[PDB]
């Protein structure tokens, strides 16, 4: 938070699971598998709608930077 694009770049690394460069809804499920939660596909897709400008069902590094640039 605090209007920082660099923080968004670091957080994107936390979201991708295969080191493939794109966050897919299934890579996002692995983050919930780490918490031990079962996720429905819409929960992951609604999270993408907040910041994914394309609404493509996957967050690119650039789409991820768009999600929380400001948070202030």
Number of H helices, E strands in the chain: 4, 2
Determine, following the binding rule CB under 5 A, whether residue 67 of this chain makes contact with Ca ion: no
Closest distance to Ca ion from the beta carbon of 37 (Å): 19
Tell me the β-bridge partners of 59. 23
Q: Which residue of 12, 28, 44, 52 would you call a contact of Ca ion, by CB under 5 A?
A: 52
Q: Is residue 58 a known part of a binding site? A: yes
Instruction: State the CB neighbour count (10 A cutoff) for residue 50.
Output: 9
Evaluated on CA atoms 36, 40, 42, 45, the torsion sign reads positive
Q: Is residue 41 a known part of a binding site? A: no
Q: Which residue of 63, 64, 65, 67 would you call a contact of Ca ion, by CB under 5 A?
A: 63
Task: Give the residues lining the site for Ca ion (CB under 5 A).
Answer: 16, 20, 22, 27, 52, 54, 56, 58, 63
């Amino acid at each position: 938070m605090g209007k920082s694009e660099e923080e968004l770049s670091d957080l994107f690394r936390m979201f991708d699971k295969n080191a493939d460069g794109y966050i897919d809804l299934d890579e996002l499920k692995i983050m919930l598998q780490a918490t031990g939660e079962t996720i429905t596909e819409d929960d992951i897709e609604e999270l993408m709608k907040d910041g994914d400008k394309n609404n493509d069902g996957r967050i690119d590094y650039d789409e991820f930077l768009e999600f929380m640039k400001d948070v202030e």
